[PDB]
C-alpha cells in the first residue's frame, strides 16, 4: 500500500530474456502457422471468429517498439496465439498439433527463465 512495498524483483533483463524466448519460438520447426498474421482476406471465417488475431511477427514488432509494459503482457500475447489456434483448428490437424507443441515449448521456457 502507500509507502509499503514488497522487495524490488529485478526486471532489467526481462526485455532481453523475452526476446530470446521469442527467437527460440521463431526458429522452432513447428512455428510456421504462427510466423505471420493470418491472411484475413484469404481465410474464410477468421476475421469474424477470432476477435484478437496475434502472431509472432506482431509480438516481435510490439516487443521491439516498447509496446509491452511488462513480461506478463508479453506472455498474454504469446498465449493468445495458441488460444486462437485452438479456437480455429481441430486438435487432429497439422496446425492444431503445432499449436499444442508450441504452447508446451513456450511454457517450459517461461517457467525455466522466470519461475
UniProtKB/Swiss-Prot annotation:
Transmembrane segments: none annotated. It is found in: Nucleus. Residues 9-113 form the Bromo domain. It comes from the Eukaryota. Expressed at varying levels in several tissues, whereas a smaller transcript was expressed specifically in testis. Belongs to the WAL family. Regulatory subunit of the ATP-dependent BRF-1 and BRF-5 ISWI chromatin remodeling complexes, which form ordered nucleosome arrays on chromatin and facilitate access to DNA during DNA-templated processes such as DNA replication, transcription, and repair. Both complexes regulate the spacing of nucleosomes along the chromatin and have the ability to slide mononucleosomes to the center of a DNA template. The BRF-1 ISWI chromatin remodeling complex has a lower ATP hydrolysis rate than the BRF-5 ISWI chromatin remodeling complex. Component of the BRF-1 ISWI chromatin remodeling complex, at least composed of SMARCA1 and BAZ2B, which regulates the spacing of histone octamers on the DNA template to facilitate access to DNA. Within the BRF-1 ISWI chromatin remodeling complex interacts with SMARCA1; the interaction is direct. Component of the BRF-5 ISWI chromatin remodeling complex, at least composed of SMARCA5/SNF2H and BAZ2B, which regulates the spacing of histone octamers on the DNA template to facilitate access to DNA. This is Bromodomain adjacent to zinc finger domain protein 2B. The gene is BAZ2B.
Amino acid at each position: 500500500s502507500m509507502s509499503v512495498k514488497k522487495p524490488k524483483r529485478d526486471d532489467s533483463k526481462d526485455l532481453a530474456l523475452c526476446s530470446m524466448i521469442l527467437t527460440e519460438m521463431e526458429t522452432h520447426e513447428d512455428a510456421w502457422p504462427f510466423l505471420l498474421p493470418v491472411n484475413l482476406k484469404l481465410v474464410p471465417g477468421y476475421k469474424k471468429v477470432i476477435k484478437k488475431p496475434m502472431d509472432f511477427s506482431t509480438i516481435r514488432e510490439k516487443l521491439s517498439s516498447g509496446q509491452y509494459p511488462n513480461l506478463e503482457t508479453f506472455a498474454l500475447d504469446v498465449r493468445l496465439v495458441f488460444d486462437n489456434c485452438e479456437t480455429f483448428n481441430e486438435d487432429d490437424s497439422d496446425i492444431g498439433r503445432a499449436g499444442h507443441n508450441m504452447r508446451k515449448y513456450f511454457e517450459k521456457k517461461w517457467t525455466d527463465t522466470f519461475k
